């Protein structure tokens, strides 16, 4: 087996969660859905209703 | 001759003629670690640096 799995990228914004010991383990791309952009705007991973 | 400077938050390798001193912990004193100037209390915590 010999594959490439190459994917291009575009300049976008990201919200990086920093857990204990300095690891990320979680991120939110604020360019795919309005929900992700809302999560990035308020700096939270759980959004309330409204 | 263009002398380009680069830090990239990397461990500094080229320093100046300044002489190093002794580490004074648990006391509000001035610090110049890698050029970072300021004043604080050098105290160790349980952080895990990569």
């Amino acid at each position: 087996a010999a594959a490439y799995f190459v994917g291009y990228l575009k300049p976008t914004t990201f919200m990086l969660k920093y857990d204990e010991n300095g690891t990320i383990t979680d991120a939110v791309d604020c360019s795919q859905n309005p929900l992700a952009e809302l999560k990035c705007s308020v700096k939270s991973f759980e959004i309330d209703k409204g | 001759v263009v002398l380009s400077f680069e830090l990239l938050n990397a461990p500094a390798t080229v320093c100046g003629p300044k002489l190093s001193t002794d580490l004074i912990k648990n006391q509000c004193v001035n610090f110049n670690f890698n050029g970072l100037t300021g004043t604080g209390v050098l105290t160790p915590s349980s952080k895990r640096f990569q």
Binding site: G7, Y18, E20, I24, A27 | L8, N9, F49
Partner: peptide, 18 residues
């Protein structure tokens, strides 16, 4: 065939707490 939350690198060398 889809990069599902893949390719997340550290932007800099600065350590950050929670």
């Amino acid at each position: 065939h889809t990069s599902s939350m893949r390719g997340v690198y550290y932007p800099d060398e600065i350590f950050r707490s929670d």
